[PDB]
RNA sequence: CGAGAGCUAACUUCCGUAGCCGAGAGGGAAACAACCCAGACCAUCAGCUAAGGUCCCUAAAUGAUCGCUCAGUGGUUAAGGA
RNA sequence: GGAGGUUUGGCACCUCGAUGUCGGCUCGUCGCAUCCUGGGGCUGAAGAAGGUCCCAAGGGUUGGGCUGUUCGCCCAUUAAA
RNA sequence: CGGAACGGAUAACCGCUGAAAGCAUCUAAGCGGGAAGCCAGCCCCAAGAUGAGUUCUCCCACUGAAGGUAAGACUCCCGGAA
């Protein structure tokens, strides 16, 4: 279980029926959450109270608390995941917005962020993505990296900045 | 209105010339007075153990003979076949009670 | 012996589906075509209301049915097969949806086809029938 | 979406460069803008236009009016174009510009009654290795007692002709301006001198 | 005749089985249920008998 | 139900035994000689029930109370796994 | 331990007042336990060519010599026969 | 000349956020990606879709179910890559 909580000093929540409101530095971000479950904060700190111990009704509190936690913190302090490509080549630059990569194949490989979502690359090998919803910070960090999955042998294609990876051998 | 319960008279708020199954009282003579389980009259109606307070009279009228009717029996394959007549006696009565 | 009446009526009624299940509300409608709720004066004629269903896009499927429930329908050629449509993008022509249930339920005679007639869903919010003046029932039943 | 309407002339030998070519000559004269079908005043947007004009006397009142309505001649032929809003009348040459690739729609040449080995390429049997079925026939026709069925759809001895039909792609080689003429590459279908139509490729290929 | 007075039950939000329940739990109601229905063709004793059975489950 | 023969196959074959069918209508089992209910003298626009049932088709509680399964399991098996 | 009913059967239930039988030819259509093609997982997968399992029935699956053959063998090709 | 592209929802599969177990996990709520296959997209039929659809236009309101008629079809003649 789970339940102790730290809201901060610039942001607020409200409460309807199980499903919050949050604004901040960056407000918006709502979460969808069960009417089943107590939706409640004391004031200076929050909570999620469990009303009944059932499985499938203990389940939804630590989804829930783990939710809240990232979409309150995330609009207070942020979210950024940066990643390394790897391999000859493999080059990466921003078109405007857009993240061009060069890696490894025919053509460029190219990606739009989806709203909310900012690339950047500050080393030509780096790429960087920014922004509140950690959901989808996820998602685009994952669009970039299946574009080039480490191979087993020797390992080319994107990788999470510090990652380690296994090599099969081979010939 | 109301109508004659089969199963052997009884019945509620009429006033008609009504057949029904044979009464062993012969002629015109009965003058039947039957007990009723339900009355609208005055269209206020009356049911229940309300109703073996009032009965109604009703003169009888004509013994009688029903319209004939067959009583056919097959059975497939078996030959058999049947056949039989038959007709229903009743005793007709027109309705004056209370 | 027996009382019997003329068709002398023509009933009217605003049937809604939001949020019922289907099914539910397709028993409530086809005992009200097939005439159960007055004193269902005669099986030989359809004495039953006619019945408005509004909103039926809002219907409810109480399941997982939403998916996974399938819709075969055979076109006599060979691979003309169980031709599927199944699930919510039969909701891409929803009123043919709910037909089917009070279809599925109303007899398969010349009689139980000619009272479909009276069966008019509307997936809106709205019904051209204002000049039949349609009268409100309730989804609940008791 | 747009198009226009014509008769096929006749076909050709043409040489583009040094390349011969078989064209087919529509023509595909003006065509009056009839009526404007629009959906907010007919539920779906289309327009309607006229080919091969015919002798006053010959029309109906009720068509005379028809085109009345538009101050247009009457013409034997209408037709509706999906999507189409033109300008004035359809002239051939403003819808066409020389190379691009026009579908070419026109009724099939009616063979009539035709065999199988005629209608779907049957195969046929031995002319000679015994039979009686010389040749023709379409032999058996289904299974045996279960489905007792002949299939629905099963092909047979029929009317092969006279159907509608679309050929895709066909190219524009040349566009004569001032005599509403317009050649296409290959073949377009019908007798010579019936109807056809000419219009943008239904599938816009890369 | 069930068929047709259980709809009357209904019509009074009774039904078919609480009701003759309810014209069986007073003794008195013997009558066969043709002329219930005939009584179903006239709804105020209908009625009568609805809220006669009624007060007999209670 | 109890055996043999068979492969502890068979709407298999051969005996014992009970019941049905043959010779059996009527309600149930969607349909159905064998199963479950129940042995049709005749007539009725009368009543209680059997088996079986009570959401609509389709007669009759969208019955009541404590649960169980979220699989359409229900509405086609097992060794074995979770 | 199951599955399927395509084999050789068992059994003897409808058909001996007739249910034409093997091979070919002609038309086909269906299953999928998938020959090709498409999407995958693992591989003793460097690459290429593979193996093997999963999802997939839209379409496709060659022509000849031998024999009545089905089949099988062979010629010569195939994305595949 | 064609099979096709673009689209949508999907199978095996691959993942994002993530608990029940203060770890981990593609799933238990939720979300995204993924086939010659499913729906749509191409070509043809089709309102006897008795649920009979729409639009444009024409003849009008005649005399005693009938009858002269309008708008307008047909019969027949001559022919047709029908
Ligand atoms: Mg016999
Ligand atoms: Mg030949
Ligand atoms: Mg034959
Ligand atoms: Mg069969
Ligand atoms: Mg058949
Ligand atoms: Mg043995
Ligand atoms: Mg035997
Ligand atoms: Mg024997
Ligand atoms: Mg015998
Ligand atoms: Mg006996
Ligand atoms: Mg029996
Ligand atoms: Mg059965
Ligand atoms: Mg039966
Ligand atoms: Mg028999
Ligand atoms: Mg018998
Ligand atoms: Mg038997
Ligand atoms: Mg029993
Ligand atoms: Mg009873
Ligand atoms: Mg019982
Ligand atoms: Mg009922
Ligand atoms: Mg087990
Ligand atoms: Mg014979
Ligand atoms: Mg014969
Ligand atoms: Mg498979
Ligand atoms: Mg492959
Ligand atoms: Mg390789
Ligand atoms: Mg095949
Ligand atoms: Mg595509
Ligand atoms: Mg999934
Ligand atoms: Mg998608
Ligand atoms: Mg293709
Ligand atoms: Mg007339």
Redesign the interface.
């Given at each position: 279980g789970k339940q102790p909580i730290a809201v901060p000093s610039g942001v607020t929540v409200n409460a309807q029926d199980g499903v919050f409101k949050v604004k901040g530095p960056k407000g918006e971000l709502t979460v969808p959450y069960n009417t089943e479950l107590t939706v409640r904060q004391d004031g200076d700190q929050l909570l999620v109270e469990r009303p009944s111990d059932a499985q499938k009704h203990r389940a939804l509190h630590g989804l829930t608390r783990t939710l809240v936690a990232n979409a309150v913190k995330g609009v207070s302090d942020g979210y950024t995941i940066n990643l390394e490509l790897r391999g000859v080549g493999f080059r990466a630059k921003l078109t405007g917005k857009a993240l061009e990569m060069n890696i490894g194949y025919s053509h460029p490989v190219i990606i739009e962020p989806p709203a909310g979502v900012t690339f950047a690359v500050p080393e030509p090998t780096r790429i960087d993505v920014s922004g509140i919803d950690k959901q989808l910070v996820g998602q685009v960090a994952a669009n970039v990296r299946k574009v080039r999955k480490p191979d087993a042998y020797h390992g080319k294609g994107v990788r999470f900045v510090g990652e380690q990876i296994a090599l099969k051998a081979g010939k | 209105m109301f109508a004659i319960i089969q199963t052997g008279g009884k019945q509620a708020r009429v006033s008609e010339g009504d057949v029904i199954r044979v009464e062993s009282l012969q002629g015109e003579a009965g003058d039947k007075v039957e007990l009723k389980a339900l009355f609208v009259g005055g269209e206020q109606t009356v049911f229940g153990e309300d109703a073996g307070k009032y009965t109604v009279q009703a003169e009888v009228v004509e013994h009688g003979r029903g319209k004939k009717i067959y009583i056919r029996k097959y059975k497939s394959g078996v030959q058999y076949r049947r056949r039989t007549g038959h007709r229903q006696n009743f005793t007709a009565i027109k309705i004056l009670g209370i | 012996k027996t009382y019997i009446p003329k068709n002398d009526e023509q009933n009217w009624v605003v049937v809604d589906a939001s949020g019922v299940p289907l099914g539910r509300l397709a028993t409530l409608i086809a005992s009200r075509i097939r005439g159960k709720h007055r004193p269902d004066f005669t099986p030989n004629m359809i004495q039953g209301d006619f019945v408005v269903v509004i909103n039926a896009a809002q219907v409810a499927l109480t399941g997982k049915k939403l998916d996974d429930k399938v819709y075969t329908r055979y076109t006599?050629?060979?691979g003309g097969l169980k031709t599927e449509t199944a699930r919510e993008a039969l909701s891409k022509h929803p009123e043919r949806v709910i037909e089917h249930a009070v279809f599925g339920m109303l007899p398969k005679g010349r009689q139980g086809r000619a009272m479909h007639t009276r069966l008019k869903v509307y997936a809106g919010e709205t019904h051209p029938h204002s000049a039949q003046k349609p009268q409100v029932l309730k989804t609940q039943p008791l | 979406m747009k198009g226009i309407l014509g008769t096929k002339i006749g076909m050709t030998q043409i040489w583009k460069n040094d390349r011969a070519i078989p064209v087919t000559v529509v023509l595909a004269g003006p065509c009056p803008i009839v009526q404007r079908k629009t959906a907010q005043t007919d539920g779906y947007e289309a327009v309607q236009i006229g080919y091969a004009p015919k002798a006053e006397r010959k029309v109906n009142k009720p068509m005379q009016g028809h085109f009345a309505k538009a101050g247009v001649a009457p013409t034997r032929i209408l037709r509706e174009f999906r999507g189409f809003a033109p300008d004035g009348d359809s002239v051939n040459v403003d819808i066409f510009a020389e190379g691009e690739k026009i579908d070419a729609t026109g009724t099939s040449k009616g063979k009539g009654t035709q065999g199988v080995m005629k209608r779907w390429n049957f195969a046929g049997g031995p002319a000679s290795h015994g039979s009686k079925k010389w040749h023709r026939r379409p032999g058996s026709i289904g299974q045996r007692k279960t489905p007792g069925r002949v299939?629905?759809?099963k092909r047979m001895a029929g009317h092969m002709g006279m159907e509608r039909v679309t050929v895709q792609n066909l190219e524009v080689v040349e566009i004569r301006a001032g005599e509403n003429l317009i050649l296409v590459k290959g073949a377009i279908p019908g007798a010579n001198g019936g109807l056809v139509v000419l219009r943008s490729a239904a599938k816009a290929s890369a | 005749w069930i068929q047709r007075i259980n709809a009357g039950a209904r019509l009074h939000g009774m039904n078919y089985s609480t009701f003759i329940n309810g014209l069986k739990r007073a003794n008195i109601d013997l009558n066969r249920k043709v002329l219930a229905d005939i009584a179903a063709r006239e709804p105020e004793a209908f009625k009568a008998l609805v809220d006669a059975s009624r007060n007999a489950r209670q």
């Open positions: - | - | 006599g050629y060979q | 299939y629905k759809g | -």
